[PDB]
Write a protein that holds these residues in place. Structure first.
Motif, PDB file in Angstrom:
ATOM      1  N   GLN A   5      -2.745  -2.279  -3.386  1.00 40.27           N
ATOM      2  CA  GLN A   5      -3.865  -1.340  -3.304  1.00 40.27           C
ATOM      3  C   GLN A   5      -3.534  -0.060  -4.068  1.00 40.27           C
ATOM      4  O   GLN A   5      -4.355   0.808  -4.128  1.00 40.27           O
ATOM      5  CB  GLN A   5      -4.169  -1.108  -1.819  1.00 40.27           C
ATOM      6  CG  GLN A   5      -4.692  -2.390  -1.147  1.00 40.27           C
ATOM      7  CD  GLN A   5      -4.838  -2.273   0.336  1.00 40.27           C
ATOM      8  OE1 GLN A   5      -5.788  -1.630   0.776  1.00 40.27           O
ATOM      9  NE2 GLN A   5      -3.921  -2.912   1.068  1.00 40.27           N
ATOM     10  N   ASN A   6      -2.288   0.139  -4.438  1.00 35.11           N
ATOM     11  CA  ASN A   6      -1.842   1.424  -4.967  1.00 35.11           C
ATOM     12  C   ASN A   6      -2.388   1.653  -6.361  1.00 35.11           C
ATOM     13  O   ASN A   6      -2.359   0.741  -7.236  1.00 35.11           O
ATOM     14  CB  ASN A   6      -0.323   1.494  -4.895  1.00 35.11           C
ATOM     15  CG  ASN A   6       0.151   1.315  -3.473  1.00 35.11           C
ATOM     16  OD1 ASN A   6      -0.598   1.434  -2.492  1.00 35.11           O
ATOM     17  ND2 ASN A   6       1.439   1.087  -3.338  1.00 35.11           N
ATOM     18  N   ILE A  47      -9.001  -1.621   4.606  1.00 31.04           N
ATOM     19  CA  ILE A  47      -9.989  -1.790   3.518  1.00 31.04           C
ATOM     20  C   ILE A  47     -10.296  -3.269   3.377  1.00 31.04           C
ATOM     21  O   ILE A  47      -9.355  -4.056   3.214  1.00 31.04           O
ATOM     22  CB  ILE A  47      -9.516  -1.168   2.193  1.00 31.04           C
ATOM     23  CG1 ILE A  47      -9.378   0.348   2.276  1.00 31.04           C
ATOM     24  CG2 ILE A  47     -10.441  -1.609   1.082  1.00 31.04           C
ATOM     25  CD1 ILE A  47     -10.626   1.074   2.720  1.00 31.04           C
ATOM     26  N   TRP A  86      -6.435  11.514   3.685  1.00 37.44           N
ATOM     27  CA  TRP A  86      -7.673  11.551   4.489  1.00 37.44           C
ATOM     28  C   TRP A  86      -7.407  12.238   5.819  1.00 37.44           C
ATOM     29  O   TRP A  86      -8.317  12.927   6.320  1.00 37.44           O
ATOM     30  CB  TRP A  86      -8.270  10.159   4.675  1.00 37.44           C
ATOM     31  CG  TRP A  86      -8.560   9.357   3.451  1.00 37.44           C
ATOM     32  CD1 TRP A  86      -8.454   7.999   3.420  1.00 37.44           C
ATOM     33  CD2 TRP A  86      -9.015   9.757   2.138  1.00 37.44           C
ATOM     34  NE1 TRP A  86      -8.862   7.519   2.220  1.00 37.44           N
ATOM     35  CE2 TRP A  86      -9.176   8.569   1.396  1.00 37.44           C
ATOM     36  CE3 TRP A  86      -9.359  10.970   1.533  1.00 37.44           C
ATOM     37  CZ2 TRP A  86      -9.608   8.558   0.075  1.00 37.44           C
ATOM     38  CZ3 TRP A  86      -9.776  10.971   0.219  1.00 37.44           C
ATOM     39  CH2 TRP A  86      -9.863   9.772  -0.508  1.00 37.44           C
ATOM     40  N   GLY A 141       2.159   3.428   1.738  1.00 38.52           N
ATOM     41  CA  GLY A 141       3.421   3.619   2.526  1.00 38.52           C
ATOM     42  C   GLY A 141       4.699   3.318   1.691  1.00 38.52           C
ATOM     43  O   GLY A 141       5.807   3.835   2.010  1.00 38.52           O
ATOM     44  N   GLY A 162       0.803  -1.214   0.000  1.00 33.22           N
ATOM     45  CA  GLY A 162       0.000   0.000   0.000  1.00 33.22           C
ATOM     46  C   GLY A 162       0.839   1.267   0.000  1.00 33.22           C
ATOM     47  O   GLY A 162       1.981   1.206  -0.435  1.00 33.22           O
ATOM     48  N   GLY A 191      -1.611   8.121   6.987  1.00 31.68           N
ATOM     49  CA  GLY A 191      -0.429   8.592   7.691  1.00 31.68           C
ATOM     50  C   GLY A 191      -0.619   9.957   8.352  1.00 31.68           C
ATOM     51  O   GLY A 191      -1.604  10.650   8.123  1.00 31.68           O
ATOM     52  N   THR A 214       0.846  -0.695   4.339  1.00 32.34           N
ATOM     53  CA  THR A 214      -0.632  -0.634   4.358  1.00 32.34           C
ATOM     54  C   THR A 214      -1.152  -0.821   5.799  1.00 32.34           C
ATOM     55  O   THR A 214      -0.572  -1.613   6.552  1.00 32.34           O
ATOM     56  CB  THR A 214      -1.212  -1.713   3.426  1.00 32.34           C
ATOM     57  OG1 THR A 214      -2.617  -1.723   3.642  1.00 32.34           O
ATOM     58  CG2 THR A 214      -0.676  -3.078   3.707  1.00 32.34           C
ATOM     59  N   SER A 215      -2.128  -0.021   6.169  1.00 30.40           N
ATOM     60  CA  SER A 215      -2.820  -0.019   7.467  1.00 30.40           C
ATOM     61  C   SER A 215      -3.856  -1.184   7.490  1.00 30.40           C
ATOM     62  O   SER A 215      -4.389  -1.434   8.545  1.00 30.40           O
ATOM     63  CB  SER A 215      -3.408   1.372   7.745  1.00 30.40           C
ATOM     64  OG  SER A 215      -4.474   1.596   6.887  1.00 30.40           O
ATOM     65  N   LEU A 216      -4.128  -1.804   6.340  1.00 28.45           N
ATOM     66  CA  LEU A 216      -4.962  -3.050   6.241  1.00 28.45           C
ATOM     67  C   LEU A 216      -6.428  -2.797   6.712  1.00 28.45           C
ATOM     68  O   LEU A 216      -7.158  -3.788   7.030  1.00 28.45           O
ATOM     69  CB  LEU A 216      -4.329  -4.136   7.116  1.00 28.45           C
ATOM     70  CG  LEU A 216      -2.962  -4.649   6.660  1.00 28.45           C
ATOM     71  CD1 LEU A 216      -2.368  -5.589   7.698  1.00 28.45           C
ATOM     72  CD2 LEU A 216      -3.026  -5.237   5.268  1.00 28.45           C
TER      73      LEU A 216
HETATM   74  N1  LIG Z   1       8.003   5.035   4.207  1.00 28.99           N
HETATM   75  C1  LIG Z   1       7.198   4.296   4.971  1.00 28.99           C
HETATM   76  N2  LIG Z   1       7.671   3.216   5.634  1.00 28.99           N
HETATM   77  C2  LIG Z   1       6.804   2.463   6.348  1.00 28.99           C
HETATM   78  N3  LIG Z   1       5.491   2.662   6.594  1.00 28.99           N
HETATM   79  C3  LIG Z   1       5.068   3.744   5.898  1.00 28.99           C
HETATM   80  C4  LIG Z   1       5.843   4.614   5.167  1.00 28.99           C
HETATM   81  N4  LIG Z   1       5.035   5.618   4.641  1.00 28.99           N
HETATM   82  C5  LIG Z   1       3.857   5.445   5.180  1.00 28.99           C
HETATM   83  N5  LIG Z   1       3.803   4.302   5.892  1.00 28.99           N
HETATM   84  C6  LIG Z   1       2.580   3.680   6.461  1.00 28.99           C
HETATM   85  O1  LIG Z   1       1.900   3.138   5.334  1.00 28.99           O
HETATM   86  C7  LIG Z   1       0.536   2.917   5.764  1.00 28.99           C
HETATM   87  C8  LIG Z   1      -0.392   3.208   4.625  1.00 28.99           C
HETATM   88  O2  LIG Z   1      -1.745   3.115   5.069  1.00 28.99           O
HETATM   89  P1  LIG Z   1      -2.852   3.915   4.269  1.00 28.99           P
HETATM   90  O3  LIG Z   1      -2.459   5.345   4.206  1.00 28.99           O
HETATM   91  O4  LIG Z   1      -4.077   3.619   5.006  1.00 28.99           O
HETATM   92  O5  LIG Z   1      -2.893   3.313   2.727  1.00 28.99           O
HETATM   93  P2  LIG Z   1      -3.465   1.874   2.199  1.00 28.99           P
HETATM   94  O6  LIG Z   1      -2.809   1.612   0.864  1.00 28.99           O
HETATM   95  O7  LIG Z   1      -3.341   0.939   3.308  1.00 28.99           O
HETATM   96  O8  LIG Z   1      -4.861   2.403   1.901  1.00 28.99           O
HETATM   97  C9  LIG Z   1      -5.805   1.426   1.352  1.00 28.99           C
HETATM   98  C10 LIG Z   1      -6.761   2.135   0.446  1.00 28.99           C
HETATM   99  O9  LIG Z   1      -7.547   3.073   1.242  1.00 28.99           O
HETATM  100  C11 LIG Z   1      -7.600   4.303   0.535  1.00 28.99           C
HETATM  101  O10 LIG Z   1      -8.885   4.933   0.568  1.00 28.99           O
HETATM  102  C12 LIG Z   1      -7.238   3.961  -0.928  1.00 28.99           C
HETATM  103  O11 LIG Z   1      -8.244   3.364  -1.745  1.00 28.99           O
HETATM  104  C13 LIG Z   1      -6.154   2.913  -0.722  1.00 28.99           C
HETATM  105  O12 LIG Z   1      -5.856   2.134  -1.895  1.00 28.99           O
HETATM  106  C14 LIG Z   1       0.277   3.937   6.871  1.00 28.99           C
HETATM  107  O13 LIG Z   1      -0.082   3.302   8.062  1.00 28.99           O
HETATM  108  C15 LIG Z   1       1.628   4.608   7.172  1.00 28.99           C
HETATM  109  O14 LIG Z   1       1.837   4.626   8.580  1.00 28.99           O
END
Ligand SMILES: Nc1ncnc2c1ncn2[C@@H]1O[C@H](COP(=O)(O)OP(=O)(O)OC[C@H]2O[C@H](O)[C@H](O)[C@@H]2O)[C@@H](O)[C@H]1O
Ligand SMILES: CC(/C=C/C(=O)NO)=C\[C@@H](C)C(=O)c1ccc(N(C)C)cc1
Ligand SMILES: [Zn+2]
Length: 281
Positions: free
Chosen positions: A104-105, A203, A62, A45, A43, A57, A199-201
């Protein structure tokens, strides 16, 4: 839609102290060496180090909307480069340590890195991909297609068809592409190791796929700066930057992170390259 549940936003970050981070990445190397079938889940991140904001984040899309502030891009999607993490995933595929990749990206960076599309589920769509509403033929463009929510881009199909091309970006109410979801699920169920990166997992069902690995006693590793929905289900949680974690992992595995050639599309996984011999564990 305006009231769409955006989940838990802007949770505090966690940083494993350095000795603990080193030991957990050594344990991640140990699980990769021991596993027959490894599935990566990515995801937003994994793209934040390219200057694309994540969603949830501290400065995510959001999170900032919730505080009445704006997320910030440090790139366009066209000018963004694959991270060290994206190119590590290219290599792990090439040497046969990665069976499948579930993302998810929408940012188009796994595709553009040269990661093989036949080992990739793009569960939420790709900003660079439009699909013929008639023949289902996909086109991977050099620029973002210009619409979101599965709308007509204004271009027509050029397959020996003239069908209406539409974007592949799902809106909140849109169910997941059936082919991508079915392959991701099959990969996740069959895996003995599922590794989550950035990903925060939160969805469904995307974030739930890694739990399918726990069926029949698979292992689950979560790499993330924030807590995630399934933390309690993890065999191992690594709290650190995904590039730091993946560079260290590749060094333990005795793999180079390969050069990015610039934007390139690979339809089909090449034959697997030689890989290092495994340690005695
Ligand atoms: N460089 C990094 N290193 C490690 N963790 C990271 C970093 N950058 C950010 N993070 C973490 O990366 C995590 C990203 O979580 P989210 O932001 O929820 O993205 P998703 O892909 O899970 O979002 C899912 C869907 O929801 C949306 O509506 C869209 O439809 C998406 O496709 C965070 O907890 C950060 O702490
Ligand atoms: C951050 C991102 C992808 C990141 C990625 O793919 N990282 O890997 C895409 C931006 C375009 C975004 O999605 C968005 C969506 C809805 C919205 N409103 C409903 C106002 C405002 C912005
Ligand atoms: Zn067509």
């Amino acid at each position: 839609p305006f009231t769409a549940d955006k989940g838990k936003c802007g949770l505090p970050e966690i940083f494993d102290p350095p000795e603990e981070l080193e030991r957990k990445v050594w344990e991640l190397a140990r699980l990769v060496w021991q596993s027959s079938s490894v599935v990566f889940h990515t995801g937003a991140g994994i793209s934040t180090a390219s200057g694309i904001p994540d969603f949830r984040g501290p400065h995510g899309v959001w999170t900032m909307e919730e505080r009445g502030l704006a997320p910030k891009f440090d790139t366009t999607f066209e000018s963004a480069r694959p991270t060290q993490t994206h190119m590590a995933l290219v290599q792990l595929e090439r040497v046969g340590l990665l069976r499948f990749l579930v993302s998810q990206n929408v940012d188009g960076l796994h595709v553009r890195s040269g990661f093989p599309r036949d080992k990739l589920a793009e569960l939420h769509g790709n900003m660079f991909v439009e699909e013929c509403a008639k023949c289902k033929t996909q086109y991977v463009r050099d620029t973002v297609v210009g619409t979101m929510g599965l709308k007509a881009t204004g271009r027509l199909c050029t397959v020996a068809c003239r069908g209406e091309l539409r974007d592949t970006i799902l809106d909140w109410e849109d169910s997941l592409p059936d082919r991508d979801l079915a392959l991701a699920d099959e990969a996740s169920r069959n895996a003995d190791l599922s590794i989550t990166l950035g990903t925060s997992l939160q969805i469904r069902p995307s974030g739930n796929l890694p739990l399918a690995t726990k069926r029949r006693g698979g292992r689950l590793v979560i790499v993330n700066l924030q807590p995630t929905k399934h933390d309690r289900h993890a065999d191992l949680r690594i709290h650190g930057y995904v590039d730091e974690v993946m560079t260290r992992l590749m060094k333990h595995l005795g793999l180079e992170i390969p050069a990015w050639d610039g934007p390139r599309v690979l339809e089909r996984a090449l034959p697997p390259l030689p890989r290092p011999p495994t340690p005695k564990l």
